[model samples]
Target: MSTFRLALIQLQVSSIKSDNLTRACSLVREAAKQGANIVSLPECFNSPYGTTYFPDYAEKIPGESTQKLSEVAKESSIYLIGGSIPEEDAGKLYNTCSVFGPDGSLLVKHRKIHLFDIDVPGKITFQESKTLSPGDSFSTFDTPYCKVGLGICYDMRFAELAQIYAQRGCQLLVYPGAFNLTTGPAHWELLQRARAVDNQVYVATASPARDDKASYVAWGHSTVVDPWGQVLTKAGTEETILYSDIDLKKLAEIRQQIPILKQKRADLYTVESK
Candidate 1:
């Protein structure tokens, strides 16, 4: 199919880890019933989004969290982007996202390449480096519709990552992100649009639904941006499923007209992963 429906789940995470998993699976089933071929969950959908909570809630990749993701993906028969979760490995915790195939196979896993270690004194001051390790490889996978690139929250900020993915022939980029009040309002949608327009690819982000009383408040506006840099659909700060039809034909049309990728002055300089 040249076009496919993607469902982004803006999950409202709670302290109860088991309940969070259950809610996320139920949401996946609901989205599948709505005719979504692909579905995604928010960043840290299984645990609270904070450095202090990572260690306590973190589990191995093939542990409880991913097992549930695999189950739901197989049951629903959809490509499942199991949003970012606290991953524990060899005594080190990393924020990771696991993608599952329709047949319940582990497709790929992306660790947060750029940790969210920002310090905006008056508004917010948090650090993932204090608890998590960064991932090294650029995560991407093949689907029947298109090649999809994977990125976690802060990873979306780096334009080079998106460019490399575009160069690698990806037509759609999925970021499971969590942005706070200050940074979210400042750069969340702006970054997604920038990447989409620059790479001429579709960008979709999944964010946790806002929790006012939680230790760390998330700016919950899950979004999907087209190659033309238009916002197709966006979720509010509530738990909801946002669906968008990705048109690869439209992307090819835009690329044929603009031809930015082909027109790049590679003779002078270029961006590449080292």
Candidate 2:
């Protein structure tokens, strides 16, 4: 009963916002038809991934994008991670991932805690903080199979977030991320494996398919790793749905065999949450 099929949609994001939404819904339905209990979309699935476009495409939680997400989740009767979107809230925009239950109810919306503000001199210099605001709290949701933790693209870079989610009893962590060509090749899979091995929990990431012509080129390699840090399934730089079975029973066995969590020296070090 601790096993469930997970599907990650590596969608091809376009500047045409409505088309992106329509395509995402169809993909969710397809994944559900293929027996996915939980389906996820990539970051900024309904909009382009750039600071300039955030303001134009930003929407409220109950607005166009989420309403479609809710309908599709209920229609498919699957847990849907609606992926990261530009969210308009209280006069500010935030990078947000909204989760929907099988009953079409909003489970939890995780605004990206870490804004991707990087300046790799010769390579890339993208600053999300120029337009987007940072999220305050950690978000986790419960399912019949296991408790799932959620994070957006930049949020995955912080190891502490994953540690806290593991401490909070999340068996599977999902990140709706969109890493660019530079960082994507360098740390996309590396960070995911690191988080999986360190936390001893299943880790999954969804990324938008690479659009070479777009302003921001995404490194489209959506991936899923097991508790043992083995990559179960991975997607190429194209539009497709990557699927994997998350086995919590196997996760428990691995944790028991390693016993690192149990052997932690409380006097030496401890991770606390505020």
Candidate 3:
């Protein structure tokens, strides 16, 4: 398959759901016009990024948000990564990522397993589990261009999740995140690059633009790294749409150079019975 172009939509989102959806659709159309085969939106594009707001903003997977995104995907004729939204099901909410095919079919839905619960200095605290339930499955999809893995913000901290995606034949990993300034500056890019290096696959993260006036500030540096762990494109602190071309052939070359996954010592690391 030929190289696929990716568009990362990093936007400043407000608490208004209709406005956010309108802006997201416009960005998807712009990305398609720029020759992007796949366009990704920031985390919680349908609502603001906080658990306190999830209960009010949460919707079902095939509900309003998905229907709106499907129309945009079909119209643009491009794969759409509806970054993440507050998902409501079974009396619980989840930070969920949904992908739609160019024909507007539902491709995959990945609910974030690792919820953010941290207390920083100066009393900045977040407790996602209080409102959101952890997802139990790792999700991936087979595309014409590459095998794609789906993950959300906090999932980036766990290498095991990335390993599962790699073992499942994933050649590209997508992380829809809205990290705080405290951990974002120190760990965001470092962790993304590390996962790409270890998995030998491309890694892309889409984040909402930083808003100092918001309840919690996000570190908005949406970035795309190649198989060789090289950053090809990154969104600055401002709200912008970033694009990059991913070469599947380069992924094969990187795996050939470092066949660590193939040479794993599974026998030595087997779990013991209690």
Candidate 4:
């Protein structure tokens, strides 16, 4: 029975940077104590999830947030997926996710590929490009349990990215996102299940807890979808940790039963990976 236990930290973020970091690390410790092998945090774990705060809270790779995340990963002896952070790389700012191994080595540095520039008229509107630069490449890394693909909030909307990762031997695709009230209710679980069923792989998403008063209110239903497109576990619009076990046996059995991926029409429609 090969199983991988995972934890998702769905917490609230405020203007206080160090306090948020401490809260996240404390949750990580709790997750590890509960026997989680891999723990993931919500988007912008160190700061608020708004465009206005990106410039103010942006930090370099070896900055305070990443350093604290690395220390926690090493301290807990578990793989840590530090959620999307406002990154100050060179002259540009990016929404990036950093992954750390049990030894505290930074494994994957994934900048959000898709920028959320949406205008739903009266509903909601956001433009990430104003303060953040888009990432040129996608990233993936290997864990003891499987090959994992990484993405940020807006990046989960793109199916081509998941298709590429599915073809690249990635067993699990994780996205640390802060989907807002407008898009979260409509397409959050729908998109997660869609990608999981289409790719025939496990899909896990982490979302920050909802802040009703904030300019950009997050839809805090952090969820995990299995290979069979079932919502294994989901968090409500509150601060909590969502945990689930990844069963590779179940993944293999599902793929064996329904071979939808084997009947791909690559000749007519193609999804290329880089």
lDDT of 4 by residue, 154-240 (tens): 899999999999999888899999888789889999999988999999999999899898788999999999989999999999999
Predicted candidate 3 versus true structure: per-residue lDDT over 26-96, tens digit per residue: 98999999999989998888888777899999999898989999999999988899999999998989999
Q: For candidate 2, which ten residues in a row score worst on lDDT? A: 257-266
Report lDDT (Cα) of residue 56, candidate 3. 97
Better of 2 and 3 by lDDT: 2
Off by over 4 Å in 4: none
C-alpha lDDT score of every prediction, in listed order: 0.94, 0.94, 0.88, 0.92
- The better-scoring model by lDDT among 2 and 4 is 2
Cα lDDT tens digits for candidate 2, 6-125: 999999998899999999999999999999999999999999998999999999999999999999999999999999899999999999999999999999999999999999988999
For each candidate in turn, the TM-score is 0.99, 0.99, 0.95, 0.98
Better of 1 and 3 by TM-score: 1
Clashing pairs in 3: none
Provide the lDDT at 150 for model 3: 85
Which regions of candidate 2 are displaced past 4 Å? none
RMSD of each: 0.7, 0.7, 2.2, 1.0
